[PDB]
Design a protein around this ligand. Structure first.
Ligand SMILES: [Ca+2]
Length: 216
């Protein structure tokens, strides 16, 4: 049994594809897409937007267990991610693509999610990359919020206003789980897939991919 895409890579499987990982000291399984042919491989994808349109306006439980198809657009699952990132140290790499043919990335030396009891509050440290000199995810990491679980710091309901599950602040500079907009409908959308630091607020990205890997 493998707990992540690195373990899978270090055991011989060095080819891109969906793999079956299993929760830590558990019997429960979960399928994640493994990026093995880039950056050295061993990358476990925790979310992807490319467009195979999955609808990310999902419930707390769906964000907890994950949804979508591992070969297309999906969300791995907060519970699984929380257990992995609290086991050992992991980096988080956020890859983005716009509609003009550009791609940039943000990398965090350390990333982890608190337990569900603390609403899967995100924790980020050590930012580098070309998608911002400052994190597009509010520092002082926020609790995770969904349409049926308001845990942002807004009087408002960020998840309902922007759509999807995210670590919204008073909503904040990002939401990669927002509504997908086609080209020429990607400008001025406080409802789309945004990553402020790179394309400013309003621009809705064409594709995104969030992946993690330890210090391997
Ligand atoms: Ca609120």
């Amino acid at each position: 049994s493998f707990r992540d895409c690195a373990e899978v890579f270090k055991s011989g499987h060095t080819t891109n594809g969906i793999y079956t990982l299993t929760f830590p000291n558990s019997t429960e399984e979960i399928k994640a897409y493994c990026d093995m042919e880039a950056g050295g491989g061993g990358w476990t994808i925790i979310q992807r937007r490319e467009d195979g349109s999955v609808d990310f306006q999902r419930t707390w439980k769906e964000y907890k267990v994950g949804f979508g198809n591992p070969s297309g657009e999906y969300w791995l699952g907060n519970e699984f991610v929380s257990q992995l990132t609290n086991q050992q140290r992991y980096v988080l790499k956020i890859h983005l693509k716009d509609w003009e043919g550009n791609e940039a990335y943000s990398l965090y030396e350390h990333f982890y999610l608190s337990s569900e009891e603390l609403n899967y509050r995100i924790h980020l440290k050590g930012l580098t990359g070309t998608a911002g000199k400052i994190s597009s995810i509010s520092q002082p990491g926020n609790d995770f919020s969904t349409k049926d679980g308001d845990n942002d710091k807004c009087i408002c309901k960020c998840s309902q206003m922007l759509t999807g599950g995210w670590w919204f602040d008073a909503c904040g500079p990002s939401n990669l789980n927002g509504m997908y907009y086609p080209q020429r409908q990607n400008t001025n959308k406080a409802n789309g897939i945004k990553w402020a630091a790179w394309k400013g607020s309003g621009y809705s990205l064409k594709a995104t991919t969030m992946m993690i890997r330890p210090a391997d």
